[PDB]
């Protein structure tokens, strides 16, 4: 055999916290690789969800019990360097609907910012599920 969606991840460079306790935007947090889907699967057939459930954004949380959070967006690039926007928690950027690369597709997790307070240094995780429709 049956079709199997795969989802791997490669972590990018460590993120430096600024003196205001926030982080820069557009930092490569890391790279998701989605594979194992049918030919002709479009970006709107792909939905990354997490527990926070914020439409369009993934939320990372600190591992220290202090609930420090930051958000990120998920954006791939096609061959001519236009944005590929998959659904994140049900939602999408308008205009970034695109057929996925054959076999597998990389998506960049790009930093937005702190969500509710100064950030503390440490480890941050987010448990992501991907649903791919029309398989």
């Amino acid at each position: 055999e049956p079709a199997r969606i795969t989802l791997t991840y490669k972590e990018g460079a460590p993120i430096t916290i600024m003196d205001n306790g926030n982080i820069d935007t557009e930092l490569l947090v890391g790279t998701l690789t989605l594979g194992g889907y049918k030919t002709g699967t479009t970006s709107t057939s792909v939905n990354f969800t997490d527990a926070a459930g914020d439409p369009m954004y993934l939320t990372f949380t600190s591992q220290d019990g202090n609930n420090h959070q930051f958000t990120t967006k998920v954006i791939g690039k096609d061959s001519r360097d236009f944005d590929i926007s998959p659904k994140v928690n049900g939602e999408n950027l308008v205009g970034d609907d695109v057929v996925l690369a054959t076999g597998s597709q990389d998506f960049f997790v790009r930093s937005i910012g702190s969500k509710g307070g100064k950030l503390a240094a440490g480890k941050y995780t987010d448990a992501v599920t991907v649903t791919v429709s029309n398989q």
Partner: protein, 201 residues
């Protein structure tokens, strides 16, 4: 009017794995004037900073290599050194010039040690003896306390060395106080989770 100074190190501690070739740390001149960056290692020269002295133009960043060449360190415990990074600016009326010496912990960690500090942070035990709050640290890591409270009052913190103790001076009003709270600083420089415990006899 007022003059301004500032040195930034890319991290607030350096975890150095025993026997590693070296590590790099970013140094930034956050000022609108060039400085000389002068870097030195102090005990609590096996470690070598390169370059020991170099010029850094306004708003620029460069990196230092910290490298171990020799030295003999316990393998049952962490060792502590200080990396100091000094920004030297250019050269009755009172004229003073300042220079910031920004100092961070260089923690020497044997690969022989299992785990990390935040996994043993909860194991601190606490005691009042001779009017002083005494912490015991049974782990092989420096317990770098970043927040400490006793009977609801804030105590200036200090590291607890590995397999050892530290005594803290207490402000009056903590007669029959029993409840200690603490956070350590994790390896990335952040305030970790809150632990809470009663003092023992």
């Amino acid at each position: 009017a007022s003059k301004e100074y500032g040195v930034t190190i890319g991290e607030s501690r350096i975890i150095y794995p025993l026997d590693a070739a070296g590590v790099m740390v970013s140094v930034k001149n956050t000022q609108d004037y060039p400085v000389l960056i002068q870097s030195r290692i102090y005990d609590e020269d096996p470690f070598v900073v390169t370059p020991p002295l170099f010029r850094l133009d306004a708003k620029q960043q460069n990196s230092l290599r910290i490298a171990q060449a020799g030295g003999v360190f316990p393998r049952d415990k962490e060792s502590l050194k200080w990396l100091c990074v000094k920004g030297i600016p250019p050269k009755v009326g009172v004229f003073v010039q300042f220079a910031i010496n920004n100092c961070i912990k260089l923690l020497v960690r044997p690969n022989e040690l299992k785990g990390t500090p935040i996994q043993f942070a909860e194991n601190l035990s606490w005691k009042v003896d001779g009017g002083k709050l005494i912490a015991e640290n049974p782990s092989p890591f420096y317990m770098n306390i970043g927040e400490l409270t006793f009977g609801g009052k804030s105590i200036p913190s200090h590291y607890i060395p590995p397999k050892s103790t530290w005594a803290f001076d207490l402000p009056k009003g903590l007669a029959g106080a029993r409840n200690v709270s603490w956070r350590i600083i994790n390896d990335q420089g952040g305030l970790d989770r809150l632990y809470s415990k009663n003092v023992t006899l």
